[PDB]
Amino acid sequence: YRVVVLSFELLHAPATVCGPKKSTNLVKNKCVNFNFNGLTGTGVLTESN
């Protein structure tokens, strides 16, 4: 029997390997539910300092 093991490690650094998912455009100043490289959340985005 041929055996292969995949042992990815997940979400602690700049991610590199993922996603047949198309990125949409960026909006601002609205309560929106967002996703950044698997970091999922909800809130309003703003320009930072």
């Binding site: 041929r2 093991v5 490690e9 602690h12 650094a13 390997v17 047949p20 698997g38």
Partner: protein, 49 residues
């Protein structure tokens, strides 16, 4: 540094055992990882347990 599509791995019947332990395979198409390790070998069937 690539774009992996795990669905084709799931949607093929060639594999007798396809078992994940910290994720659900239906979700693997929406996550981002740092890097992955593929460990390959061949053994006797009675030991896969």
């Amino acid at each position: 540094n690539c774009v992996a599509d795990y669905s084709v791995l799931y949607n093929s019947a060639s594999f007798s055992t396809f078992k994940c332990y910290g994720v659900s395979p239906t979700k693997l198409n929406d996550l981002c990882f740092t890097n992955v390790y593929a460990d390959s070998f061949v053994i006797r069937g009675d030991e896969v347990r």
